[PDB]
Design an enzyme around this catalytic site. Structure first.
Site, PDB file in Angstrom:
ATOM      1  N   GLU A   1      -6.290  53.936 -19.323  1.00 51.94           N
ATOM      2  CA  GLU A   1      -5.919  53.990 -20.721  1.00 51.94           C
ATOM      3  C   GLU A   1      -7.191  53.828 -21.554  1.00 51.94           C
ATOM      4  OE1 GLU A   1      -1.338  52.789 -20.779  1.00 51.94           O
ATOM      5  OE2 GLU A   1      -2.680  51.230 -21.557  1.00 51.94           O
ATOM      6  N   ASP A   2      -8.321  53.737 -20.865  1.00 53.27           N
ATOM      7  CA  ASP A   2      -9.621  53.610 -21.502  1.00 53.27           C
ATOM      8  C   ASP A   2     -10.207  55.025 -21.609  1.00 53.27           C
ATOM      9  OD1 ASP A   2     -12.144  52.070 -22.270  1.00 53.27           O
ATOM     10  OD2 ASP A   2     -12.861  53.125 -20.490  1.00 53.27           O
ATOM     11  N   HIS A   3     -10.733  55.366 -22.781  1.00 48.24           N
ATOM     12  CA  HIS A   3     -11.302  56.688 -23.015  1.00 48.24           C
ATOM     13  C   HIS A   3     -12.364  57.136 -22.008  1.00 48.24           C
ATOM     14  CE1 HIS A   3     -13.839  59.759 -25.038  1.00 48.24           C
ATOM     15  NE2 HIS A   3     -12.637  60.265 -25.257  1.00 48.24           N
TER      16      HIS A   3
END
Length: 144
Positions: free
Chosen positions: A123-125
């Protein structure tokens, strides 16, 4: 035996995967914090507190002093010291069971420290950039 391939994104996890403690520390620093700001301080911290053994016996007042450029320095310092202690003292299968580690740190761990990237949904870019790229080129690399 699992070596995460080098991506054109140079995630900090790619440089620290060899030491899970350092990789997880990095995710603690990067959590909700700008990379441009957090990374420089991270290298400073790792220079003064190079290991979990050192970080766990550390004085939070001193650590927080080094973490001032990132704000919330007292909380960060205590979390880092507590996680380090649990990492070395607690019985764990996945780091998410340790204080200070959440989805971001666990996903980082499961993509870089153990071979479970195919099961991870970041969910981290930057993690998504790396993960998408790993999926895009895993055929051509040699992996999973």
């Amino acid at each position: 035996k699992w070596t995460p391939p080098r991506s054109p994104f140079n995630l900090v996890q790619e440089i620290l995967f060899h030491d899970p403690w350092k990789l997880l520390i990095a995710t603690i620093f990067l959590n909700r914090t700008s990379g441009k700001m957090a990374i420089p301080v991270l290298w400073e911290f790792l220079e003064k507190y190079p290991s979990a053994e050192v970080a766990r016996a550390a004085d939070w007042r001193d650590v927080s002093e080094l973490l001032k450029p990132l704000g919330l320095y007292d909380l960060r310092a205590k979390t880092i010291i507590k996680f380090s202690d649990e990492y070395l003292t607690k019985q764990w299968r996945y780091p998410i069971e340790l204080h200070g580690i959440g989805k971001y740190g666990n996903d980082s761990y499961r993509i870089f420290c153990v071979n479970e990237w195919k099961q991870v949904h970041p969910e981290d870019h930057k993690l998504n950039k790396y993960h998408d790229w790993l999926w895009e080129n895993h055929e051509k690399l040699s992996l999973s």
